Structures are given as structure tokens and as C-alpha cells.
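Example 4.3 (complexes with small molecules)
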Amino acid sequence: SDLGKKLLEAARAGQDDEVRILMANGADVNAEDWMGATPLHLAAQSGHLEIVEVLLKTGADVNAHDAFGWTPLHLAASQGHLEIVEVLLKAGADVNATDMVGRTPLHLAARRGHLEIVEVLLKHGADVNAQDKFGKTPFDLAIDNGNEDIAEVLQKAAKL
Ligand SMILES: [Cl-]
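Answer. The structure with chloride ion bound is encoded below.
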């Protein structure tokens, strides 16, 4: 609980050595804060790859959802952290997991303009036709945000 609180913020801040000490001293790797974020969520969101790999190696739940439904893959796709996206997928992250608004990681990558992430999620079986609670596909979010290259790629993937 107490070390868990410290682990969350050391993961967010990229404090590799502190993460390691906290885990060796028994910090709960799946500790949650007020919004259900776990250390893996915060490391994946803030782009700290080594810490993501350490947490995965010592039992972090790769498919944990926070209070908003976001999984660590949602957060890394949204924030554009490609290597972390790949490690999470390799650790078994659900490529088509959905959040509170029905969005998948591909929705968020398209909304945020992250073409490399879009291309990698597609090659790992992301659902181009998934519809969020607003009735929007990833293609719709690419158009809404003026991301024409992502939109063209998503079109080609839907066609074939
Ligand atoms: Cl684009």
C-alpha cells in the first residue's frame, strides 16, 4: 500500500533504480491509485520502456483497466510509444480491448496521429471496423483530426 503508492509515482517519473528497490522490498506491482492506474499504466503512458519491462517481468497485469477503461496498451498507443506498444503486445496485451467510451488502442492512435502505432496495431490484428460509443471507427477519428495518411492506411486495411 505505502510502497505501492511510491511505486506508482516512481514508474510515472522514470525512476528505474527506485522502481527496482521498491519491488525488491515487496511493493505491490499491481497497486492502484484513485483512478485505478497501476504502475504499468503509468510507465506505459509516460514512455518508460525499461520500467515497463521490469513491471511485466515481476507480475504486472498487462490487461488491467483503469477507471476510464484504459489499458496500458491504450495509454502507450495514445501517447505514441512504439516500443512499449510492442512489448505490451508481446506480453499478451489485448489489441482490441475497449475503454469506457468503447475505444480501442487503434482508435486512440488514429485520433492522436501516431502512424507507426496504427501500422503496428494493424499487423497485430487490430479491428479496423470497431465502433466506439459515439459510432466512430478509427477511420472516423483520423478524419476528425485531419490525419489523412492514417485514414488512407485504415481504408486499405478495411478493403483487404
Ligand atoms: Cl496522418
